[PDB]
Amino acid sequence: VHLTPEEKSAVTALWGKVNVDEVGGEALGRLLVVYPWTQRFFESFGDLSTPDAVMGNPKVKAHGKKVLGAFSDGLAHLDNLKGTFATLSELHCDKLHVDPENFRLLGNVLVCVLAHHFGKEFTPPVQAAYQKVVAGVANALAHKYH
Amino acid sequence: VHLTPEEKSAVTALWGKVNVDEVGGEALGRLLVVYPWTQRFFESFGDLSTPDAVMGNPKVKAHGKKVLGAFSDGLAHLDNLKGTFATLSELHCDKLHVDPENFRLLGNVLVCVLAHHFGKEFTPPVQAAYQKVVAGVANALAHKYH
Amino acid sequence: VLSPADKTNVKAAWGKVGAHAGEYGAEALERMFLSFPTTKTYFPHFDLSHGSAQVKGHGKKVADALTNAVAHVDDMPNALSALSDLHAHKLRVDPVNFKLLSHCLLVTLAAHLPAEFTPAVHASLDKFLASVSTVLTSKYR
Amino acid sequence: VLSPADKTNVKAAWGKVGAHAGEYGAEALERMFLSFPTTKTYFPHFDLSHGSAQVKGHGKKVADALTNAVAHVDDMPNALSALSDLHAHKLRVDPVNFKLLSHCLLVTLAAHLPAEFTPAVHASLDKFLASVSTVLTSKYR
Ligand code: HEM
Numbered sequence: 118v119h120l121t122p123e124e125k126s127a128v129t130a131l132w133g134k135v136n137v138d139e140v141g142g143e144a145l146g147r148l149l150v151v152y153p154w155t156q157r158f159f160e161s162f163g164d165l166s167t168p169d170a171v172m173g174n175p176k177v178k179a180h181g182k183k184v185l186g187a188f189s190d191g192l193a194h195l196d197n198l199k200g201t202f203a204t205l206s207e208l209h210c211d212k213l214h215v216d217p218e219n220f221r222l223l224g225n226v227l228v229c230v231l232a233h234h235f236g237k238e239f240t241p242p243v244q245a246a247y248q249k250v251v252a253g254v255a256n257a258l259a260h261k262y263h
Numbered sequence: 264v265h266l267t268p269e270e271k272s273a274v275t276a277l278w279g280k281v282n283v284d285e286v287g288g289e290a291l292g293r294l295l296v297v298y299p300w301t302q303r304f305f306e307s308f309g310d311l312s313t314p315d316a317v318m319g320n321p322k323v324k325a326h327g328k329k330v331l332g333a334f335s336d337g338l339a340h341l342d343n344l345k346g347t348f349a350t351l352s353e354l355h356c357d358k359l360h361v362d363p364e365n366f367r368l369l370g371n372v373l374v375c376v377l378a379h380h381f382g383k384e385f386t387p388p389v390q391a392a393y394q395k396v397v398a399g400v401a402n403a404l405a406h407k408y409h
Numbered sequence: 410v411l412s413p414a415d416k417t418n419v420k421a422a423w424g425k426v427g428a429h430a431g432e433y434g435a436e437a438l439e440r441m442f443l444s445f446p447t448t449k450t451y452f453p454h455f456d457l458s459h460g461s462a463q464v465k466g467h468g469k470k471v472a473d474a475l476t477n478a479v480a481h482v483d484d485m486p487n488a489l490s491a492l493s494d495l496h497a498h499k500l501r502v503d504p505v506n507f508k509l510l511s512h513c514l515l516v517t518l519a520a521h522l523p524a525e526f527t528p529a530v531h532a533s534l535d536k537f538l539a540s541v542s543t544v545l546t547s548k549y550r
Numbered sequence: 551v552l553s554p555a556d557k558t559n560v561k562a563a564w565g566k567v568g569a570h571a572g573e574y575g576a577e578a579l580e581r582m583f584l585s586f587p588t589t590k591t592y593f594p595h596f597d598l599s600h601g602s603a604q605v606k607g608h609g610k611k612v613a614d615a616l617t618n619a620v621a622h623v624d625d626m627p628n629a630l631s632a633l634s635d636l637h638a639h640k641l642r643v644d645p646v647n648f649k650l651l652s653h654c655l656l657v658t659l660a661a662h663l664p665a666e667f668t669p670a671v672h673a674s675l676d677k678f679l680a681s682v683s684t685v686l687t688s689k690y691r
């Protein structure tokens with residue numbers, strides 16, 4: 118993914134403010150609430166009955182932190198996303214058989230979470246940069262389908 | 264795309280029986296009728312006002328031939344679909360900006376056309392083989408998007 | 410959203426299915442299982458073999474549900490609520506799967522009703538199936 | 551298909567937008583144009599620059615239609631018929647573009663109404679926008 122220097126600066130500056138212990142959990146929870154068929158993949162997580170149960174799930178938050186970590190990894194290797202996410206692509210595609218549209222949904226909910234936490238600062242140009250990154254990650258994850 | 268010898272045989276054998284002058288136009292025509300937003304790409308074709316008008320359009324039938332020719336090309340090079348469709352990918356992605364879901368729709372309507380034409384001969388296993396081919400083609404056309 | 414023309418097309422074509430309903434239903438499932446093997450995942454405890462009586466039986470259920478949808482075209486959510494519950498709430502079927510079965514049903518219909526499967530009817534049938542899929546993937550109760 | 555609670559959530563959330571509906575629709579458009587440049591293709595005759603007055607006026611239009619839709623939640627096809635005509639029949643907008651706009655709208659709302667943008671409201675608005683999108687992309691008259 119090619120980011121202009123200004124874009125990279127914008128991306129980085131906002132990412133420096135993200136609460137690493139919370140955002141991925143927020144994102145994963147919202148995916149499970151907004152697109153409920155995704156719960157099928159996390160039945161082992163326990164109670165996902167309601168919005169509150171989902172958002173309050175410890176397993177959801179723990180897992181969310183792992184997800185965020187993968188996004189941080191991507192941000193540092195935008196040049197080589199397919200290589201960086203090779204193992205995650207095999208897991209998601211070959212083993213779990215997650216439909217690739219789901220990768221797109223999670224990236225978009227992540228964007229909605231950033232907008233939620235950063236309001237004012239999440240300007241159109243900042244969102245545009247983040248849309249490239251998230252499309253990049255989604256494409257790398259779906260590589261095995263390609 | 265990898266077809267077992269058995270699958271390639273099945274595909275191959277049926278394809279030699281396809282009316283290359285007509286099947287492509289039927290397929291393009293049905294894409295335009297079934298998913299009408301696709302017509303926006305063929306405005307220069309004239310009268311696409313009614314199913315009747317789409318199906319009897321000379322430009323649709325002529326263009327249909329070209330599309331089918333591309334599928335025949337894929338069949339002959341299942342090996343290097345990506346290499347084979349490189350120029351077509353560039354046309355469709357970077358010159359026309361066709362959303363990739365549209366490639367899958369055309370692939371599926373072709374399948375419907377084959378079923379309509381061959382009746383009982385278009386068996387479940389024959390379809391399965393054809394689905395791998397159509398997905399391979401759509402994936403090769405979408406390459407520039409990946 | 411279906412046009413009056415759509416509803417008429419659908420009633421006419423589905424009507425021609427008749428007592429073949431179940432057979433057509435079973436064939437569509439077998440087409441799905443072979444073409445998109447990932448769908449088998451939702452049927453862990455089925456005998457998905459070639460002339461499986463389980464699939465034939467299920468095919469009949471699917472076909473009857475479509476007949477039901479046709480005979481309640483104007484108020485589907487109310488007529489298919491129990492099916493939404495099963496598919497959406499209990500099974501949590503990824504919506505992509507509905508596109509696969511819909512496609513396999515269209516293929517089946519094309520292979521069996523050559524005179525009825527005109528571009529206009531193909532268009533209405535696709536729209537109808539997308540309508541049904543939307544109901545079955547939604548949690549509206 | 552929307553549940554009764556979805557309907558309540560949308561009405562409530564849309565209520566909080568109120569006076570800013572217009573500014574929000576304009577921002578949503580701007581976000582879409584920047585983030586998904588291919589969408590600009592439908593507006594060749596538009597000044598798509600930052601403070602473009604055209605986008606601002608167009609944002610109002612979009613927002614007014616959503617307000618109407620919220621008001622006619624149980625009756626969208628009837629309410630939006632003219633808009634369906636324009637988008638589906640005249641402009642022939644590819645349905646993917648409705649997902650892009652819907653997403654940009656959610657982002658705008660999340661950005662401006664953080665307290666109101668709870669998981670449940672987010673879920674309800676997403677379904678609402680999908681329903682609007684379905685109406686606008688189908689020809690049924
Ligand atoms: C941007 C998209 C995504 C990213 C970056 C991502 C990242 C990850 C990461 C880092 C893990 C942990 C791997 C490990 O065990 O070391 C994981 C596991 C998993 N992911 Fe994702 N994921 C994404 C999308 C999804 C989606 C959309 C789904 C399903 C709807 C999904 C389902 C799963 C499941 C079920 C596991 C569990 C594997 C296990 O715990 O055995 N993921 N993902």
Ligand code: HEM
Pocket residue numbers: 301304305329330333334351355359361365366369370400401404
């Ligand atoms: C499997 C999918 C497809 C295949 C194999 C295919 C194949 C082709 C071929 C062989 C050409 C002619 C290039 C030449 O002039 O030599 C072409 C052109 C074109 N295709 Fe496709 N196509 C596919 C899907 C689509 C879709 C889904 C759309 C739009 C909805 C589309 C829109 C066009 C247009 C607008 C042109 C015209 C360019 C021109 O000839 O001036 N194609 N395609």
Ligand code: HEM
Pocket residue numbers: 448451452470471474475492495496500502506507508510511541542545
């Ligand atoms: C047009 C769309 C569909 C229709 C009309 C439909 C209809 C039905 C019906 C009537 C039943 C049986 C309920 C009963 O016991 O009375 C059923 C069950 C089921 N359906 Fe579907 N279905 C559709 C799509 C799908 C798809 C796309 C999948 C997943 C790939 C799926 C997976 C299942 C499963 C797993 C069961 C339960 C079987 C069992 O455990 O006995 N369905 N469906």
Ligand code: HEM
Pocket residue numbers: 589592593611612615616633636637641643647648649651652682683686
């Ligand atoms: C939430 C979904 C949408 C709604 C409620 C909506 C609403 C509207 C409204 C109210 C108008 C002007 C009607 C009039 O007063 O004549 C309009 C026009 C238009 N819309 Fe949309 N729209 C939506 C999505 C889209 C999308 C996704 C696109 C393409 C990316 C699009 C492209 C257009 C265009 C090109 C026009 C005509 C502009 C002109 O020539 O002035 N719309 N829309």
